[PDB]
Amino acid sequence: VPREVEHFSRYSPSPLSMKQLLDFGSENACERTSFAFLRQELPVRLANILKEIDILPTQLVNTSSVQLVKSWYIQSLMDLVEFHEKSPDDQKALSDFVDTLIKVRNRHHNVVPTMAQGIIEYNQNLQYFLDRFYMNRISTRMLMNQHILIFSDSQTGNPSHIGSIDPNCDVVAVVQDAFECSRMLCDQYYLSSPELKLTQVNGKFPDQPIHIVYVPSHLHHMLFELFKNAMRATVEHQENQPSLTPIEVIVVLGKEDLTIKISDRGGGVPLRIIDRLFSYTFGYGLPISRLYAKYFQGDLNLYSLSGYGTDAIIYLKALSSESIEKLPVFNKSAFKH
């Protein structure tokens, strides 16, 4: 155990809200501040999760695949710790940091499948760990991307966005895209794909467009995954008739909640097996997409009617200020689990 990882674990991750993240990019010409935050936060999160890997079962940590993960994280942690001596005023430091972050985003690019093989080689504590390990990566990928897309010279992301956050996200538009994205995957395999019957309701101000601060890609991931599932299930279960049953989506904005319910008539699944769809042990989709919903204090649930069809609901937070990161911490409360 390298002295830096034992050290930086001895801190707790600091969750940020999308309001705050938003701010690192507005009147704020200060990447000076992002640099001092992230050169501290990234090592802490990586160190926390490296520590929780040491408790994984003997046979598991010693898989080729986990050992490769260990070494990348340990490498990026090292690389980030080296920026600790420089000042946030050092223009040369600010820029190397962008490159090193790009370097770490790259190094970690194979992390999520590698991890899978790592388990597909070796119960309920796996699940607990995989959910945390993956949330950990979602959160670091997001902080690095955010910094990279706001400050780097040559990755400027979507101009509407501050980083990858759309402060005025057209929720239904994302629903159409993700559906129209899944709709054309399904046509690679079937003579037909379900249509989209969609309804919106604006709690706050009625008959006005639905917009909230969110990260459009995370939403896109959730919805696509759930639309693909709906379609495949609607086409398998009705392999008889001519036209399929449409897929019904309602988008609802309320005081605190942004809710999206996706309904299909794909035959459903028994209560007993639902719990397995959300298990890592196909994917990694439903499980991951749920981590995405939960990553900012939302959620994703499945309610099926075995013999008829399935409802999928996503919950997002409606206000930037309550969209707060949900981060695992390696402490004793976690130790006993």
Ligand X SMILES: COc1ccc(-c2c(-c3ccc(O)cc3O)n[nH]c2C)cc1
| Tokens coding 185 | 């995957």
Strand order across the beta sheet in which 196-202 lies: 196-202, 247-253, 257-267, 308-317, 299-305
Residues paired with residue 312 on neighbouring β-strands, in sequence order: 262, 302
- The contact mask relative to a second copy for 291-320 (x = CB under 8 A, - = no) is -------xx-x-xxxxxx--x-x-x-----
**Residue number with CB closer to a second copy (82 or 299):** 299
Has 257 been labeled as part of a binding site?
Answer: no
Distance, in Å, from the CA atom of 278 to the CA atom of 298, rounded to the nearest integer, reads 16
Distance, in Å, from the CA atom of 260 to the CA atom of 227, rounded to the nearest integer, reads 12
Interface of this chain with ligand X, residues 229 to 268, rule: CB under 6 A: 229-230, 232-233, 264, 266-268
**Residue number with CB closer to ligand X (25 or 266):** 266
Residue 312, contacted partner among a second copy, ligand X, none, CB below 5-8 A by kind: ligand X
3-state secondary structure of 182: helix
Q: Tell me if residue 221 is catalytic.
A: yes
Interface of this chain with ligand X, residues 284 to 313, rule: CB under 6 A: 302, 310, 312
Q: Tell me if residue 332 is catalytic.
A: no
Has 286 been labeled as part of a binding site?
Answer: yes
Question: Could you say whether residue 272 binds a second copy (CB under 8 A)?
Answer: yes
CB of 268 to ligand X, least distance (A): 5
Q: Tell me if residue 256 is catalytic.
A: no
Question: Could you say whether residue 15 binds ligand X (CB under 6 A)?
Answer: no
H or E element in which residue 263 lies: strand 257-267
CB of 248 to a second copy, least distance (A): 12
DSSP 262: E
- The DSSP annotation for 209-239 comes to PPEEEE-HHHHHHHHHHHHHHHHHHHHHHTS
Catalytic residue among 31, 52, 225, 248: 225
**Closest by CA position to 170, among listed 107, 207, 213:** 213
Q: Which stretch binds a second copy (CB under 8 A): 19-27, 52-60, 254-262, 281-289?
A: 254-262
**Residue number with CB closer to ligand X (102 or 277):** 277
Q: Which stretch binds a second copy (CB under 8 A): 101-109, 156-164, 184-192, 264-272?
A: 264-272
Has 264 been labeled as part of a binding site?
Answer: yes
Has 282 been labeled as part of a binding site?
Answer: yes
| Tokens coding 51 | 């520590």
Question: Could you say whether residue 20 binds a second copy (CB under 8 A)?
Answer: no
Query: Angle between the 216-237 and 171-186 helix axes, to the nearest 10 degrees?
Result: 40
* b/e 301-329 (16+ beta carbons within 10 angstroms → b): ebebeeeebbbbbbbbbbebeebbbebbb
Q: Which stretch binds ligand X (CB under 6 A): 39-47, 167-175, 202-210, 223-231?
A: 223-231
Q: Tell me if residue 228 is catalytic.
A: yes
Distance, in Å, from the CA atom of 84 to the CA atom of 253, rounded to the nearest integer, reads 43
CB of 13 to a second copy, least distance (A): 7
- The DSSP annotation for 240-280 comes to SSSSPPPEEEEEEE-SSEEEEEEEEEEE---HHHHHHHT--
CB of 319 to a second copy, least distance (A): 11
Residues near a second copy (CB under 8 A) = 12-13, 15, 201-204, 250, 252-257, 259, 261, 267-268, 270-272, 298-299, 301, 303-308, 311, 313, 315, 325-329, 331, 333-334, 337
